[PDB]
Design a protein around this ligand. Structure first.
Ligand SMILES: [Mg+2]
Ligand SMILES: [Mg+2]
Ligand SMILES: [Mg+2]
Ligand SMILES: [Mg+2]
Ligand SMILES: [Mg+2]
Ligand SMILES: [Mg+2]
Ligand SMILES: [Mg+2]
Ligand SMILES: [Mg+2]
Ligand SMILES: [Mg+2]
Ligand SMILES: [Mg+2]
Ligand SMILES: [Mg+2]
Ligand SMILES: [Mg+2]
Ligand SMILES: [Mg+2]
Ligand SMILES: [Mg+2]
Ligand SMILES: [Mg+2]
Ligand SMILES: [Mg+2]
Ligand SMILES: [Mg+2]
Ligand SMILES: [Mg+2]
Ligand SMILES: [Mg+2]
Ligand SMILES: [Mg+2]
Ligand SMILES: [Mg+2]
Ligand SMILES: [Mg+2]
Ligand SMILES: [Mg+2]
Ligand SMILES: [Mg+2]
Ligand SMILES: [Mg+2]
Ligand SMILES: [Mg+2]
Ligand SMILES: [Mg+2]
Ligand SMILES: [Mg+2]
Ligand SMILES: [Mg+2]
Ligand SMILES: [Mg+2]
Ligand SMILES: [Mg+2]
Ligand SMILES: [Mg+2]
Ligand SMILES: [Mg+2]
Ligand SMILES: [Mg+2]
Ligand SMILES: [Mg+2]
Ligand SMILES: [Mg+2]
Ligand SMILES: [Mg+2]
Ligand SMILES: [Mg+2]
Ligand SMILES: [Mg+2]
Ligand SMILES: [Mg+2]
Ligand SMILES: [Mg+2]
Ligand SMILES: [Mg+2]
Ligand SMILES: [Mg+2]
Ligand SMILES: [Mg+2]
Ligand SMILES: [Mg+2]
Ligand SMILES: [Mg+2]
Ligand SMILES: [Mg+2]
Ligand SMILES: [Mg+2]
Ligand SMILES: [Mg+2]
Ligand SMILES: [Mg+2]
Ligand SMILES: [Mg+2]
Ligand SMILES: [Mg+2]
Ligand SMILES: [Mg+2]
Lengths: 103, 56, 117, 142, 110, 47, 150
RNA sequence: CCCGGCGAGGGGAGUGAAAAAGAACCUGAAACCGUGUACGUACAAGCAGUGGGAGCACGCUUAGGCGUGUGACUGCGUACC
RNA sequence: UGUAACGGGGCUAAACCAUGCACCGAAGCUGCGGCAGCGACGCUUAUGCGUUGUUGGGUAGGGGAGCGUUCUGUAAGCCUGCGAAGGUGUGCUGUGAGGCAUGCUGGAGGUAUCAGAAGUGCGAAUGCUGACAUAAGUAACGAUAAAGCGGGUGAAAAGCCC
């Protein structure tokens, strides 16, 4: 029993109670989100998506606080050509604990 | 002839892995006097295989 | 107004050296060498980030194939099938069910073998 | 979540047997090759040996195609003076046939350590039998 | 009690000494006195005299009892080097460091 | 208030420093290109 | 830099690099590439711009009730403790106090009081006119300054 | 006081806020050289990192298959001016 | 020098031509999140914004905007032996030069903010001065006139004394 779904431009497979990290959603720091576009559900017998997304599939989960991941150095260097620029980047994310998964 | 690059401190060590010193584990006790000695060597007090030799 | 210069000198050197922890020989001990070793790591980094997505995709694929192969089908067709299967978009990494939930993977070889037929 | 990864201390393996007879030496080597590298499963772990143990009966009776049976390279250099050594397919089959399947698949397995290891999973034998009864191998095809 | 004893500015290299020091690290004091005794190297007398001093310290400044004493730690570091000049053929002049060592012994029971 | 006043936007501008590293904008060659008379300390040609 | 101009060593032949004078700013003991010289950092300040500025900064003190103007202001003898009181009494501790014709007593007072200074009208400089919390300035003076900035 | 050659040197004791100020004496950096510990390494080829990653060893929250040190194996990979 | 004229294995198709349908494949395109530049809509003007369209490889070189250091003013202020500067860990933080907090060391100085001024930033110049590696515990210990033994003295004697 599990489900897969689109979220941050990427897909995730998951169970309820389980927490996953996604690209920043503009949702309240605590409220409950619905993911109306799940593309698979599971058991001993499971629903692949005829078209994309199983018929009446939808997942629930509460946003469990937002964040910024760890910092990454962007180094650029053109040996012998007198050029280099370095630039930092962090990248926002929001976490969800997945309550739903209604097939 | 001379190196072209500086040798690592690491290689230096390996070169010396054979430079270690060996203990003795080859010393005995005169049967007459208590004396410890090098095997086949006269004792400090001047003995050897029991038997004081070397008056002095 | 002579300017000390050498406490901020220390500053930078220590900073670069810092990032050199782990690098062998004077790569972590000596600034000149540290500093280069550091700069390239940032390059190798930039590069490998995009390479990362490459490497993984081509992992998922080979194994997806391994799985479909087990189920009597080549990755190609499979994916085509899945494609033709009333659209049906769903990741290659997500087809990791290949690894764990095998009976499920098998259930896709069907949904694909079908619409594909 | 980080994608799966086969661990060395928990991999399956399983012995198998093949009779590489009238089989075209190389179209066979290829399937061997891949099974050693575990390319038919959760190879999903190219940094880990997840193949199976295959054993090859009757190496001598191996197929070739075209004039290969008598026109094939087979060159090594002993590292001396000018010691290039050459022998021909038939000539290899004469002394140590097993070597043929080895050099073939060995050139289809990767680089170093890993591949070097995946190759210890391939026991040949030129005759018809073998002494691995102990592992009780199950036979396959291709 | 740990108790140490050290010889600073030893007139030996360090490399030269570390050799002898090595013969001895972590042995029962008693046996070290023998090993050292039969080692034909300037450094031995040097290290021997340190060990002894360590012992006499650990014996007269602390709990003591040589019998239960082990050279738990021994380690020779490098001292400052007297620089000299060496006349060489054709006017050339070379350096030469006369080096020194900092011999340290540490003798305890636990 | 002796430290609340300031110069009008634009009044006093930087001043090319030059010779001060890559990111600086004019390190090395300090903006005077490669070789020839016109580089060179005191390198020019009469009016 | 004291020392000879002799070439430290032959141009070519020794492994050594160049060398022309042991006073090379790149050599140790002596150099300074652009050795400094005594300099006159005076500026110009157009009169009308100076007068403009005071009339400006003045105006602001008013806008901030920081200029407290008074008819006459002094002390009957040269005694700081005196000036001390007057100031305590008027609730001033940081003052410019710019007097009309400027007396003497008032001067030797505050010549030890840290946060206060006394000038005549014809004195008064721009920076200090900003520095102090409160500038006082007698009406007598406000006249001399009034027409001094015209 | 003790070891030491009536040494050098050192350990105690005592002085001092401090001797982790002991006279080569404030602070005491870097190169360079050592002792200890964890992890690796004796079938394996190259700028030595970077991407993946087992094991091992120590921090997470009351396991969530994280973090940190190491790093078997593996993709890519010829320093700088 | 060595297979050495498919990169290799190996291939009778894993070559070659035709046709058809797939799949892999880039920092190209798309998706999601985020920054900037140059525009205008629409909300609405000491205008920022849902924005909204578009753009953001770069040597010589031009333009723009910033960081930090030393010193001056702001400062008879703020911080500081309930521990400064410096050293050294650690954690956090900014697009970056950087910043902040804090353990240890250190033991007396440090300075916010806004302005002012430069001996203002280093890896290279066979750069300068100092320190320390490397080869290496290798060459060598300076005439192949030469040494041996007993005895002394000494903490120790091939080298001193007899
Ligand atoms: Mg040796
Ligand atoms: Mg100064
Ligand atoms: Mg270090
Ligand atoms: Mg891509
Ligand atoms: Mg061949
Ligand atoms: Mg051969
Ligand atoms: Mg390869
Ligand atoms: Mg030298
Ligand atoms: Mg500019
Ligand atoms: Mg430029
Ligand atoms: Mg120009
Ligand atoms: Mg040039
Ligand atoms: Mg030019
Ligand atoms: Mg001079
Ligand atoms: Mg002359
Ligand atoms: Mg000549
Ligand atoms: Mg040279
Ligand atoms: Mg000078
Ligand atoms: Mg005038
Ligand atoms: Mg005594
Ligand atoms: Mg003494
Ligand atoms: Mg100390
Ligand atoms: Mg200290
Ligand atoms: Mg000191
Ligand atoms: Mg140090
Ligand atoms: Mg190793
Ligand atoms: Mg090698
Ligand atoms: Mg990694
Ligand atoms: Mg523990
Ligand atoms: Mg811990
Ligand atoms: Mg690697
Ligand atoms: Mg030939
Ligand atoms: Mg080719
Ligand atoms: Mg693009
Ligand atoms: Mg497209
Ligand atoms: Mg976007
Ligand atoms: Mg409008
Ligand atoms: Mg650009
Ligand atoms: Mg572009
Ligand atoms: Mg200031
Ligand atoms: Mg200062
Ligand atoms: Mg900042
Ligand atoms: Mg300078
Ligand atoms: Mg330097
Ligand atoms: Mg440069
Ligand atoms: Mg050496
Ligand atoms: Mg040699
Ligand atoms: Mg030799
Ligand atoms: Mg010799
Ligand atoms: Mg000679
Ligand atoms: Mg001689
Ligand atoms: Mg004699
Ligand atoms: Mg002689």
């Amino acid at each position: 029993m599990y489900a897969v779904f689109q979220s941050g431009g990427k897909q995730h497979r998951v169970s309820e109670g389980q927490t996953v990290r996604l690209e920043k959603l503009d949702i309240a720091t605590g409220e409950t989100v619905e993911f109306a576009e799940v593309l698979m559900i599971a058991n001993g017998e499971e629903v692949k998506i005829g078209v994309p997304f199983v018929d009446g599939g939808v997942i629930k989960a509460e946003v469990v606080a937002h964040g910024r991941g760890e910092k990454v150095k962007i180094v650029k260097f053109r040996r012998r050509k007198h050029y280099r620029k370095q630039q930092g980047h962090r990248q926002w994310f929001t976490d969800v604990k997945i309550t739903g998964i209604s097939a | 002839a001379v190196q072209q690059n500086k040798p690592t401190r690491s290689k230096r060590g390996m070169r010396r892995s054979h430079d270690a010193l060996t203990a003795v584990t080859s010393l005995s006790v005169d049967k007459t006097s208590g004396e410890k000695h090098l095997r086949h060597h006269i004792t400090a007090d001047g003995y050897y295989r029991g038997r004081k030799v070397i008056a002095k | 107004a002579r300017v000390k210069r050498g406490v901020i000198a220390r500053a930078r050197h220590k900073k670069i050296l810092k990032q050199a922890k782990g690098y062998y020989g004077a790569r972590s001990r000596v600034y000149r060498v540290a500093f280069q070793a550091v700069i390239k790591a940032g390059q190798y980094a930039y590069r490998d980030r995009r390479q990362r997505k490459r490497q993984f995709r081509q992992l998922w694929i080979a194994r997806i194939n391994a799985a479909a192969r087990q189920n009597g089908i080549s990755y190609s067709k499979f994916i085509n099938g899945l494609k033709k299967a009333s659209v049906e978009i769903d990741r290659k990494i997500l087809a990791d069910i290949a690894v764990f939930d095998k009976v499920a993977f098998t259930a896709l070889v069907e949904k694909a073998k079908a619409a594909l037929a | 979540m980080k994608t799966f990864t086969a661990k060395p201390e928990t991999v399956k393996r399983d012995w198998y047997v093949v009779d590489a007879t009238g089989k075209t030496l190389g179209r066979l080597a290829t399937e061997l090759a891949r099974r050693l590298r575990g390319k038919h499963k959760a190879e999903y772990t190219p940094h880990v040996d997840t193949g199976d143990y295959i054993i090859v009966l009757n190496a001598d009776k191996v197929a070739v195609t075209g004039n290969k049976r008598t026109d094939k390279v087979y060159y090594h250099h002993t590292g001396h003076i000018g010691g290039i050594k050459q022998a021909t397919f038939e000539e290899m089959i004469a002394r140590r046939p097993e070597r043929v399947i080895e050099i073939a698949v060995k050139g289809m397995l990767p680089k170093g350590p890993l591949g070097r290891a995946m190759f210890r999973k391939l026991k040949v034998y030129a005759g018809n039998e073998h002494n691995h009864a102990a592992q009780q191998p199950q036979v396959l095809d291709i | 009690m740990e108790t140490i004893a050290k010889h600073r500015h030893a007139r030996s290299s360090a490399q030269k000494v570390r050799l002898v020091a090595d013969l001895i690290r972590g042995k029962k004091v008693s046996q070290a006195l023998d090993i050292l005794t039969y080692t034909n190297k300037k450094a031995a007398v040097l290290v021997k005299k340190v060990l002894e001093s360590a012992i006499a310290n650990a014996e007269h400044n602390d709990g003591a009892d040589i019998d239960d004493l082990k050279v738990t730690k021994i380690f020779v570091d490098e001292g400052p080097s007297m620089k000299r000049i060496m006349p060489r053929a054709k006017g050339r002049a070379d350096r030469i460091l006369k080096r020194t060592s900092h011999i340290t012994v540490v003798v305890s029971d636990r | 208030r002796l430290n609340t006043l300031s110069p009008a936007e634009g009044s006093k501008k930087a001043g090319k420093r030059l010779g001060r590293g890559i990111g600086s904008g004019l390190g090395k060659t300090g903006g005077r290109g490669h070789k020839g008379q016109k580089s060179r300390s005191g390198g020019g040609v009469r009016r | 830099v004291t020392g000879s101009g002799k070439k430290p060593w032959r141009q070519k032949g020794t492994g050594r690099a160049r060398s022309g004078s042991i006073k090379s700013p790149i050599w140790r003991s002596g150099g300074v590439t652009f050795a400094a010289r005594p300099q006159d950092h005076s500026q110009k300040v157009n009169k009308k711009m100076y007068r403009g500025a005071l009339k400006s900064i003045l105006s602001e003190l008013v806008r901030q009730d920081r200029l407290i103007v008074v008819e006459k202001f002094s002390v009957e003898a040269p005694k700081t403790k005196l000036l001390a009181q007057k100031l305590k009494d008027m609730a001033l501790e940081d003052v410019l106090i710019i007097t009309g014709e400027l007396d003497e007593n008032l001067f030797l007072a505050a010549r030890n009081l840290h946060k206060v200074d006394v000038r005549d009208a014809t004195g008064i400089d721009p920076v200090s006119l900003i520095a102090f919390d409160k500038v006082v300035m007698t009406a007598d003076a406000v006249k001399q300054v009034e027409e001094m900035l015209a």
